[model samples]
Target: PHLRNRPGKGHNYIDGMTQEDATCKPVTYAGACSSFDVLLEKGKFPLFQSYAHHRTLLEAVHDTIIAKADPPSCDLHGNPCMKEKLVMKTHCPNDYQSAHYLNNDGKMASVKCPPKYELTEDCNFCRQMKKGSYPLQDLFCQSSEDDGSKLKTKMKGVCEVGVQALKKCDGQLSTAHEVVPFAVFKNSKKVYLDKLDLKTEENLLPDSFVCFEHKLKSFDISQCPKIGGHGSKKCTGDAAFCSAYECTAANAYCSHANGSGIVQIQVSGVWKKPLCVGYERVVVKRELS
Candidate 1:
C-alpha cells in the first residue's frame, strides 16, 4: 500500500490496520517536520535543504507496510519492533514539496489537497506514521500535560548545573515517556529526532540536556505552547515579571493565545512594565529574569 498525506487530518493508515492520526504528538517526526516548516518560514532555520532525505525514510517505511501485506518475514536489509518509535531529520519536506497534479493511484486523484486541488491525501505524516501528530498535539502538546508545583521529567537525567543546566548521559533514544514535556536543554549537537531507526544506536548526543519545558509557572494559567520543545523560557534570577492581564494598573502581562486562561507573552514587544511571562495557580511559579 502506498502512503498518502491527508491534509489537516494527517495520515494513519497502513497494512489494513488503521489507527487514525498519530502525528499529533510532538515526538512524531511528521509533527516535528510540520513545525520545522513553520520555523523555516520564520527564518528560525533555513528552508528544507531537500526532500530526498525524508523520501529515503519513507521508502523504507513503504517496504515495511507492504511486507506486512507479508509474504516473507520481511526484507530490505530490514527492520524491528518496540513501541515503534519514529526518528527523522529536522528538515523533511522531501516532496515534489510535491504537487503532482496528475500523481495518481491508478484511477484518479486520491484526495483533494491545498488550493482546492484533488490528489492523494498528499500529506506525508501519512507517508510515515500510521498516526499523525496533529490530533495528538491537539489532544496533548501542552503545558498542563503534567501537573505540579515543580516539573518532573521522564528522562532520568536532571539539570546538572544551574538555573540553566546540562547533563552527560549515555545517549539514549527516549520512549514516548521521554520525548517532550521536557525541552532539549542541551543538544549542542542539535540532533534531529528523525535520524534514528530501530537499528540505529541512540544517536542523540551522549551529553544532552532535556529539561522541563518551563521551570517557572506564572499566573493561574500554565499554557506554554512551543515548537521543537526548544522555545520556552524559565525566567531566571527573579526577572521582572507580570502575572495578571490588566498588568496591575498599566503593568499589562499577556492576553490569552487560545483562551485557555493562559496567554502568550511577546517578550520582544512592549509591556507596561518590564516583566517576563509565567504560570500560576495557588502561587505563581517564578519571575522571568
Candidate 2:
C-alpha cells in the first residue's frame, strides 16, 4: 500500500527485518562439532589439569569407602595394625632372685625366688608366701632346720627396730634452728626476764609454754612458771606464753643453761608443708580458614 505525501508523510511500505528476528536459534551443530574437536585436541596433550584439582578429593572419597568396608585393626599394645603397622616386643622375667618386703617400721623380711624372674600372680611371693622377689644370692628366710635361722631371727629383730628408726627420717615434721629465750624469777617477783618484752601480770606456766626447736612428749607444768612470778600458782594460763616445736630424733636438747628453753618435738605420722613456686603458662596460635 502507498499513501500520498503530505507535509512529512510519504508512501509507506512494511519495514523489513532479518530472519533472526522471526525465530530464536541456538549455535549450529557445526559450531558445536568444532568446539568438541578443539576439546578433544586439547585432551590429546594431557587431561591432567582437571584430574589434578580433584586428585585429593577423589583419594579422600576412596579412603572413606575403604575405611567403611574394612575398618581398622589395633593390636594389644594399642597400636594400629592395618595402617602404619607396628611391632611389639614382649617383656618377661626369667631367673629367680631374692628380695625383701619392707614393713611400715622399715624392717625387711627376706624372700627368695628364681634369678631375675618377673613377678606373677601365680608366684609364691605374689600368692601364698605374700613376699616379693630377691636377686641371686640375696638373703632369704631360713628354714627351721638351718643354723642360719637363729641369725636370721636376730637380724629380723634388728629390722623391726630399724623400721621405727626409718620413720624418724621421713620428712613429715617441721624444723627450726633458732635461739630460745628463758627467764628466772624468785619469790613470785620478776628477777630476770628474757629479752622478750613482757607486760605486767603476764604470767608463764609449764603447760602454757613451748619448747624451742624440740618436740615434747608432754608439757611439763612442774618446771615452767611465770616469767617474774615465783610459784606455779602465780603463773597465768596464757597459751601465747608457750610454743610447741618438733624436730628429728637425731637432735637432742641442750645439755647446759643455753638449752633451757629448747625442747625436742617429734612429728606424728602425718604433717606436710607446701613447696610450690610459680604459675604455669601455655601458648596457642590462631589460623585462618
Candidate 3:
C-alpha cells in the first residue's frame, strides 16, 4: 500500500483496509509556537520592547473578543480565576483625542475618527518600522488580519490570544439567535423575514413586503420579481439603492423595505452594516483623519 493512499479521499483504488488512516498512532510535538520566542530567536520584530508589554497586548486581545463584563476564564495563563463571584467591571472608553496628525504648522492636532472607524496603522508605517517593512494602535481590539499588513511579534501574540479564546469556549463565536430578531424589532418585520432561511409560507410579515400592492383587491405577488441571491447579477436602477442585496444564507429571500434596510451580509463570520437601499449617498469628508 502506498503511504499517500492512507488518508484517502478519492485517490485510493487498492485494498479498502489500506485506505483507512488511524491504525498506528505516534506521539509528536504538537504544541503551538510562542510569539515572543519567534521574535527573540529571529530578532525581526522590534515593537514589543519587553515581555510585559507583550502580555499587556495579549490581555487587550482577550478583552476585545470576550466581553469584559463576562467572568475571566479560570485557565488564563497569568491571571488566575477566583472562586467567588466578582464585582461588575467596565472596560475603559477609547480615547479619541490621543491620536493626531501633523498639519501645515507641523503641530500635532487632535482628531476624532468616525464611529466604528479607528486610526489604524497602514502598511507603509509598519514596513518602515521593520527597518524595511512597516502596524494598529487599536491593536488588540481587532482580529489578526490587518489591512493587507503581515503581522510580526506583538500581533502574533494577538493572533494566539484570539485563537486560544476560540479553543477555550465555543460561545466566543457570535450566534445568529442573538442578532436576527433585534433587526426585526426596529424595521418592518416582513423585511427581516425575507433574509432568513425559511419557507415562503413561513413568512409572518405582510404581503406588501414581498409583492407589489395593486389597485385591485388581489395583490400582484407574481409581478414583483426576485432580483438578488447567491448567483444573481449585480443590481441596477437607482445605483445607490440598487446595490448588492445579500440574503442571510443561500436561497434566502433578498427582499428589503421600501425606504431602506441593512444587508445582513457576513464576511468571514463578521456582520457588516452597509446600507442595502433607499439611502442618500455621500462623499469622503476626510482623507486620513
TM-score of each: 0.17, 0.13, 0.14
Worst 10 residues of 1 by lDDT: 100-109
Residues 1-289, candidate 2: write the lDDT tens digits.
0001000111011011112211111111222221112212343313211211111111121222101112211112232321211111111133322222211111222233333333333222322221112211111110011111111111111111211221223233332222211111111110111122322121222212322223222123333333443433322232343232222232222111111121111112211111100110111111112
Residue 191 displacement (Å), model 3 = 44
Model 1 scores a TM of 0.17
Clashes of each: 35, 23, 6
- lDDT by residue for model 3 (133-200), tens: 01111111111211211211121111112111212232223311111101111111101111222111
Please report, in order, the local distance difference test score of every candidate based on alpha carbons: 0.19, 0.19, 0.19
Runs in model 1 with CA error above 4 Å?
1-76, 81-92, 95-139, 143-253, 259-289
In model 3, the runs with Cα more than 4 Å from the true position are 1-31, 34-38, 47-58, 64-289
